[PDB]
Structure formats: C-alpha cells, structure tokens
C-alpha cells in the first residue's frame with residue numbers, strides 16, 4: 001500500500017443525502033487501484049496539536065488515464081470528523097490518504113447464486129463490484145437506503161435483480177427481514193456490508209442457522225451505531241491481539 005495525496009476536482013450531490021467527490025491522486029502504482037471494492041483511509045483531520053484522525057471510504061471507481069478516484073459520502077446528522085470535513089470541502093481541497101485495501105468480493109467460484117445485502121455506506125462498494133461483475137453469475141441484491149431510488153445508479157445486468165427498501169429517519173431490521181425470506185437456501189453464497197449490529201445478525205443467520213460454509217458468507221460491518229470509527233479501530237486492535245494469543 002501507499003500514502004498518497006488527493007485533490008478534489010469535482011463535487012456532486014447525486015442524491016440529497018450523498019456527496020460524490022472526485023479527486024486526482026498522486027499514485028505511483030495505479031495497478032493497485034483497479035481491483036473491485038477497494039477502500040481507502042482518508043485523513044479527515046490532522047491538527048498540528050494532536051494525533052491524526054482517519055476514516056474509511058470506498059473507491060467508487062478509479063479512472064487510470066487521469067488518476068482520478070471517486071467517493072460517496074453518506075451524510076448523517078453527527079458532528080463527526082468526516083462530516084465536519086465534508087461541510088468545508090471545496091474543489092481543490094487537498095486531503096491525505098492511505099490505501100488501497102482490497103475488501104470482500106462475492107464468491108463466483110463453483111457457480112453459486114449470489115445474495116447481497118447493503119445499506120447506504122456499502123452502496124459504493126456494490127457499484128465497484130457490479131462494474132467488474134463476473135458475467136453469467138446471477139444475484140439478488142437487497143439495499144437498505146434513505147434514498148428511495150438508490151438503485152438507479154447501479155448498472156442493469158442480466159440476472160442481477162436489485163431490491164431497495166426505504167428507511168425513514170430516527171426509528172428497524174430491514175436487511176434481515178429479507179434474509180429470512182429468500183426463495184431457496186441451497187447452492188447460494190452471501191456478501192454483505194452494513195451497520196455492525198445488523199451485519200452480525202446476518203452472519204449468525206447464515207452460519208449458525210443455515211450451515212453455510214464460512215467462505216460463502218462474506219459479511220462486514222462498515223459502521224456501528226453509537227460507536228465512532230476510531231473506537232471501532234481500538235476494538236479491532238484489541239480483538240486481534242486477543243485472537244493471536246489463542
């Protein structure tokens with residue numbers, strides 16, 4: 001991996017709750033940046049007084065003929081670092097970054113049906129995966145979003161059906177309700193990314209309840225309600241140190 005610098009070249013509001021930024025990056029190995037579902041760590045704050053603060057966002061795409069990546073930010077009413085950074089972020093804003101990180105991709109091997117679950121934070125990862133989709137594999141995709149028509153941005157591919165549910169603010173387990181209700185349960189493979197607690201629920205269902213092999217349930221928690229990314233990191237470090245001990 002590398003530590004680059006990104007400079008914002010474009011800013012869009014594709015949906016009312018999403019800010020789409022494009023930036024050139026000074027990569028010296030663009031071969032790394034072409035894989036699907038790459039994520040970066042943006043140094044959202046770097047005061048000279050104090051340790052730096054980073055946050056993880058998905059590379060929606062990487063254009064190699066101009067070294068431009070794009071990132072979708074889910075707006076959320078929180079005085080968080082990434083939110084404070086996005087409020088004052090103009091074209092030409094330079095921001096530090098570390099990456100890329102390859103992240104989960106569906107298991108196309110053996111030709112099993114793919115079933116995908118996502119909330120607003122994993123819609124960019126979904127777009128990345130769909131733009132390099134293994135033609136011939138079928139899928140059911142369930143999206144949990146605040147935007148009524150979040151699927152419109154994703155491509156139309158033969159045999160990928162994309163289902164979107166609509167959340168209303170300040171209130172449920174929708175993605176799980178979809179997992180409990182699939183047409184069949186045999187010869188399928190799972191990919192998911194959402195809030196930490198809903199993702200754990202999905203993992204528990206496809207493993208401890210439907211006996212799916214562990215490499216056929218690729219599930220991640222992109223964020224956790226009431227816990228900051230920084231706190232998630234300190235937790236992940238302590239689990240790792242405790243995992244290697246046994």
Ligand SMILES: Cc1cc2nc3c(=O)[nH]c(=O)nc-3n(C[C@H](O)[C@H](O)[C@H](O)COP(=O)(O)OP(=O)(O)OC[C@H]3O[C@@H](n4cnc5c(N)ncnc54)[C@H](O)[C@@H]3O)c2cc1C
Pocket residue numbers: 039055056057058059071072073074075076078080081082083103120121122124125221222223224225226227228229230
């Ligand atoms: C691999 C990976 C890829 C990711 N890609 C994206 C992406 O492409 N786009 C994107 O918008 N996010 C993405 N995320 C999630 C993002 O990193 C977190 O949402 C992050 O916590 C937000 O930064 P912050 O400074 O707002 O939040 P923090 O300071 O971490 O959060 C503090 C508070 O905000 C809450 N919070 C954080 N995010 C949300 C949210 N989306 N909705 C509601 N409440 C929230 C937390 O629960 C916490 O209570 C990704 C995460 C991972 C692991």
